[PDB]
Design a protein around this ligand. Sequence first.
Ligand SMILES: NC(=O)c1ccc[n+]([C@@H]2O[C@H](COP(=O)([O-])OP(=O)(O)OC[C@H]3O[C@@H](n4cnc5c(N)ncnc54)[C@H](OP(=O)(O)O)[C@@H]3O)[C@@H](O)[C@H]2O)c1
Ligand SMILES: NC(=O)c1ccc[n+]([C@@H]2O[C@H](COP(=O)([O-])OP(=O)(O)OC[C@H]3O[C@@H](n4cnc5c(N)ncnc54)[C@H](OP(=O)(O)O)[C@@H]3O)[C@@H](O)[C@H]2O)c1
Lengths: 133, 133, 326, 326
Amino acid sequence: SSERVVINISGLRFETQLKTLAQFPETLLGDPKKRMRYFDPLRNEYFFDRNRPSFDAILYYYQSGGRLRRPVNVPLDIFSEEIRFYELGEEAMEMFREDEGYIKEEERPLPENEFQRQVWLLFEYPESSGPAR
Amino acid sequence: SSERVVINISGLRFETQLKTLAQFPETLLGDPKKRMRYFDPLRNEYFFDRNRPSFDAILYYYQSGGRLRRPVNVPLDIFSEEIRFYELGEEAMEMFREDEGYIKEEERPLPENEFQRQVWLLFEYPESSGPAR
Amino acid sequence: LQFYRNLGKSGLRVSCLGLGTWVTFGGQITDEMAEHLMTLAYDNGINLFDTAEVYAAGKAEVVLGNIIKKKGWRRSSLVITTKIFWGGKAETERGLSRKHIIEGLKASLERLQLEYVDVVFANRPDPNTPMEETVRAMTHVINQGMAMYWGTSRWSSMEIMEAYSVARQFNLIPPICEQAEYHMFQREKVEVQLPELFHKIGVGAMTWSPLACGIVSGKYDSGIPPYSRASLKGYQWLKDKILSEEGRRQQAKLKELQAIAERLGCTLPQLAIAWCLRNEGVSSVLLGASNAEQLMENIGAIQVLPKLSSSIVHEIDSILGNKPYS
Amino acid sequence: LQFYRNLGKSGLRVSCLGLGTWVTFGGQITDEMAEHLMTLAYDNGINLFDTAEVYAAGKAEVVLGNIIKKKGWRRSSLVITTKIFWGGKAETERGLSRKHIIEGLKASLERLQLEYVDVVFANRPDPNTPMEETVRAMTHVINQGMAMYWGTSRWSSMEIMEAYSVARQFNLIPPICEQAEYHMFQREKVEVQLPELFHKIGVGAMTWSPLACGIVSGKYDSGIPPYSRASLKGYQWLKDKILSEEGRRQQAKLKELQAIAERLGCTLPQLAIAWCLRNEGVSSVLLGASNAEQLMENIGAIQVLPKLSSSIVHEIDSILGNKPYS
Ligand SMILES: NC(=O)c1ccc[n+]([C@@H]2O[C@H](COP(=O)([O-])OP(=O)(O)OC[C@H]3O[C@@H](n4cnc5c(N)ncnc54)[C@H](OP(=O)(O)O)[C@@H]3O)[C@@H](O)[C@H]2O)c1
Ligand SMILES: NC(=O)c1ccc[n+]([C@@H]2O[C@H](COP(=O)([O-])OP(=O)(O)OC[C@H]3O[C@@H](n4cnc5c(N)ncnc54)[C@H](OP(=O)(O)O)[C@@H]3O)[C@@H](O)[C@H]2O)c1
């Protein structure tokens, strides 16, 4: 639909089409049930008592069809929280980090066997034991 | 409460929940008696004829629960004034400075005794006397 | 469990059952009966009576109006509603234009011998009239004291939301209720589309034809009884329905439901009506009745309501096989 | 010191004392007396008279209305108020829905034989009605010329502020007054919650039962006198109060206050009433009186007011031991 949705971010007014939000339905804004909580029937708007600067990027992510660029003026820690909040999902988050210069370290393989773990830990982690040190 | 408070900063409209402000009650906005002066009963908003850019940081400080980051676009002298204005308190101010790269010099120990002061001043401050120089 | 409930989220309190006047008043039954039906219903706590400019070409309003005047009931103890769309043969006598809403409501009020109705409805959506015009007209009649509230009949959720947003945009009054068809064989709108609206903007449902005009009563298990609505002149289309292949399938499903009714110790009409009330989103069910016996039986649906456990509801859904996907 | 004052920050000027009609008019006293009381009060500058749809099932309004008509006083010299909540036995005859506000006010106006009241009140909050609906109904009756202003009775500050914000949101009219209970044994709302509202949004207080129905008069120091409100049929609950352990404690505190009264050269009723007026936030105190003597004495509270110095006020607070924490 092209029915218009008004999202009020701490007083800063945003408007978009419902079909722009519906595009991603796993998200807070894209899911009727999740955003219901924030609806103000007196003013016909969803209200969020949240950081203002971050939002355009969040909205543009829907309008652009996937572009999640952090605004230059917004700290990476505040933005990432906002992303978490609006539930944009792990994919968007990863791409965002990657583009932000953070490389996943993945995970480190584990011995499982009690002995190897016992040994491997003091031969590669001085951290693991005072003896390892 | 979740009763909504509208703060108008030189025309730029901000909204938050009263419980977000009540969080810090020593502050101008958090104290009913202090902000009363700025209330416009015709429009149901508090009006401040004050610098606009600085505010989000000020509001975000309440929403974040303590984060006081100066906006990149705002001069440190104007922001610190705004902080002073809204009465965020000496703690927030110090953290802010520190994070801003200003280290407290604390205070310099004083002799008290008239003689030492008399002497110490011309042996460590050339400033203190023409003779000290 | 509570006999009375809010119409949507408005402050208007209606009984969970109301009495309608379609087909019956000024038509199939004699005004002596009509008075009897209303009297009976009013004495049983029912405060909601629904009519329309279109029923019997206005005579339903005249009869309803006369009874209220003759009985002397206090106007404040009643919730009268009327629905407007088709008010005349002339081009300008139908629709939701400002002209027809004002003129149609004014003429119904005259036939009802009433100063105002509690809720005025748009009997169906109007593609030919801007929402703004309709919403301003409804808001107008309310401000003129011709109605206390307004609602939509037969609109889609999308349209209902459009009326609501148009109302917020222009500082007008939003609708507070949608009058939707609802019974065991027509579940889709009430159980899938209206709930969101109820929770989001407070619009409640006031459902009609809870017995699908008598079809769900079980009275048609063996053919078309004499003097039944299906046998009335003008109601052939109903007759065609019952006897159709789909009609047969319904009647067969009704035989399955009878066992549920007996389990719950009630009659099928009572079960059918109570079923309509199992969900909060429905504010009231408008009943139809051609005699006093029917009304006295149908009112008993209120005793069934507490017994509709999830399990029973599941069982019914299985019998019906038509539970809409959310 | 000023006899007249603004009701809150509105432009409506009322005497600091008004005369109510609960229990008395159309009930405990004879209309001959009622006329006498009003006449007496009006001749003494009192321009405020308060009533309600609920008092004596509407007869209080009928009696008050008759006196005004019989005396011929200029309507513009009076400030008549009426309070609406419980208007009937029927479900739709109570509450703050749009239906009941309009119908209730219209029926009171008919009983009062008046075109309009100066202030219409919501006799108590209504959890079952959206604020928007109530505020739009009140605004409606004002625009229809049925009332000049509206106020809330028995609401919390939170609710009063909600009405005010809802009013600003929809461009409606905010309430201008809250009718709160206030006397030496019920201080919390007026002295802690209402002042903010007075300074912030201009809502003033119009307090009732300044003698806690007679309890604070001292007339119950020795038991329940004959013909006292506590002895009336229907007012046992008051009787239970007086005689209760808490009642006894109050009466004992009243004996302590008597000394204050003598210091100030006045009677206890006069002191009690003047005490209610010591703070700006209170616009007017509604008095109750079952005979002319009581009224003539109570009006004398105005002479006491200038003597309530901080010190006296402190002394009282100590005697009372119930000064609420700000
Ligand atoms: N908003 C709209 O567009 C709209 C549209 C249609 C109706 N409505 C409203 O909804 C109201 C009710 O609709 P409805 O008349 O179709 O309701 P219904 O409950 O589906 O059917 C009522 C009819 O079924 C029969 N009946 C009822 N109880 C019975 C019982 N216990 N045993 C046997 N037969 C029984 C009677 O017909 P017979 O005795 O003649 O067989 C009666 O006239 C209307 O009057 C009107 O107010 C609104
Ligand atoms: N907003 C609300 O919900 C609300 C609720 C209650 C009342 N009110 C308003 O407030 C008005 C006043 O309330 P109220 O009647 O309770 O007031 P009050 O001042 O507490 O009590 C007045 C009663 O006390 C007695 N009395 C008064 N002066 C006396 C005196 N000098 N000596 C001895 N006894 C004396 C009389 O009763 P007896 O002579 O019979 O003993 C008289 O009827 C009402 O009439 C009504 O307009 C509003």
